[PDB]
């Protein structure tokens, strides 16, 4: 996700644990209810 | 060639050979030989020895027309095999002069062919296949003296004849036994 560039001849390719979002943790397997009950992220 | 030399010396004795399948090449040289021999003598018989597995109808109809239109009699000789067009041209000989050698075999059957192309083309081919098969059966009925319904039923698949069976059926007039 951090590093999700555009792919191919079209869109631009300029468009650790500290860049974490729940979009990453839903992809990990944490349900979005579990994540919002954990507002603070230490890394 | 030797084979052409023996055939040339038998052409001089008015003995011609239908020895292959009746395609247009063998038919045209037989038609040429009948036209050549009827030009030499219009009163001496042509001996047509037939060892043929049959062939094209229109090629054999060329031979059959050249046989009939020749002013001389065409004595035909079933020599080993007279199948399909070869039995036709055998039975197409001058009556009284159609011979089977005593171990020749005569195969009478309906015409084979092939349908191809569009449905309008095949309807024309089948219409012409009905014309060819009716005309081929009419002439085999005329040659053998059999009814045309007898020729239709018997030619439906391969019907084989010995020399003695072809004599009774009407393809030949004599069995040569010397």
């Amino acid at each position: 996700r951090v590093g999700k560039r555009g792919l191919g001849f079209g869109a631009e390719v300029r468009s650790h644990f500290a860049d974490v979002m729940p979009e990453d943790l839903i992809k990990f397997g944490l349900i979005p209810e579990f994540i919002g009950r954990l507002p603070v992220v230490a890394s | 060639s030797l084979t052409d030399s023996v055939y040339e010396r038998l052409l001089s004795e008015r003995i011609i050979f239908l020895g292959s399948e009746v395609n247009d090449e063998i038919a045209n040289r037989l038609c040429a030989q009948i036209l050549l021999l009827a030009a030499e003598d219009a009163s001496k018989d042509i001996s047509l020895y037939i060892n043929s597995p049959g062939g094209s109808i229109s090629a054999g109809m060329a031979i059959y027309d050249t046989m009939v239109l020749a002013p001389c009699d065409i004595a035909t000789y079933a020599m080993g095999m007279a199948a399909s067009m070869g039995e036709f041209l055998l039975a197409a000989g001058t009556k009284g002069k159609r011979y089977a050698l005593p171990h020749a075999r005569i195969l009478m059957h309906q015409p084979l062919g092939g349908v191809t192309g569009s449905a309008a083309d095949i309807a024309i081919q089948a219409e012409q296949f009905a014309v060819i098969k009716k005309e081929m059966f009419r002439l085999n009925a005329e040659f053998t003296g059999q009814p045309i319904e007898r020729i239709e039923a018997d030619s439906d698949r391969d019907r084989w004849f010995t020399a003695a069976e072809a004599l009774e059926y009407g393809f030949v007039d004599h069995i040569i036994t010397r």
């Binding site: - | 309906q110 062919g113 349908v115 191809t116 192309g117 569009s118 309807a123 296949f129 698949r157």
Partner: protein, 196 residues
């Protein structure tokens, strides 16, 4: 080559090729020649989609060059049998059997694309079928059975007389989509819907 995508449906992480995705939206795809192996596929898909929902329309995309007559009438009968209405869309060509399957869709639901080609012609034997004249008399009465049945089929679906189909399918009658709409193979040329 056919790239495969992933659908996050009620489940998610479901790998799907575009042809499974067409079939999931009840689109049967006739893009290959109508032979037995293709007709076997389409009839299986027509019966599956009738079973999944007999009320929703089955869409049939036709990019076929056409083919075998019994494979044609296998697909044809299954298109007519199922409770679902068949929406035939022509994509490129519908030639031979395919234009009959294109006309075989539900009235009102037969479409082509504006540059689609509809090629109707009489049945033909592929190559020489040989045999005795009694065999060929059967095979020629059979292709006249096939020719009459194709014209009877196109008479039901184009609204033309079967003798008019017979005069038109003497040669290759190539129709465009607007010419096949006026003929009655389709009844929608299906205007493009691009937003620009």
């Amino acid at each position: 080559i056919l790239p495969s995508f992933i659908e996050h449906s009620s489940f998610g992480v479901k790998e799907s090729n575009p042809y499974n995705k067409l079939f999931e939206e009840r689109i049967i795809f006739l893009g290959v020649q109508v032979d037995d192996a293709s007709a076997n596929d389409i009839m299986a898909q027509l019966l599956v989609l009738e079973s999944l929902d007999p009320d929703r329309d089955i869409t049939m995309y036709i990019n076929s060059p056409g083919g075998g007559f019994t494979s044609l009438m296998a697909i044809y009968d299954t298109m007519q049998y199922v409770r679902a209405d068949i929406q035939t869309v022509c994509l490129g060509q519908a030639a031979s059997a395919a234009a009959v399957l294109l006309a075989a869709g539900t009235p009102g639901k037969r479409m082509a694309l504006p540059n689609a080609r509809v090629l109707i012609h009489q049945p033909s034997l592929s190559g020489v079928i040989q045999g005795q004249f009694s065999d060929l008399e059967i095979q020629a009465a059979e292709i006249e059975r096939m020719r009459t049945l194709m014209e009877t089929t196109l008479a039901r679906h184009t609204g033309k007389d079967a003798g008019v189909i017979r005069k038109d399918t003497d040669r290759d009658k190539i129709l465009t989509a607007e010419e096949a709409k006026d003929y009655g193979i389709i009844d929608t040329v299906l205007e493009y819907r691009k937003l620009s």
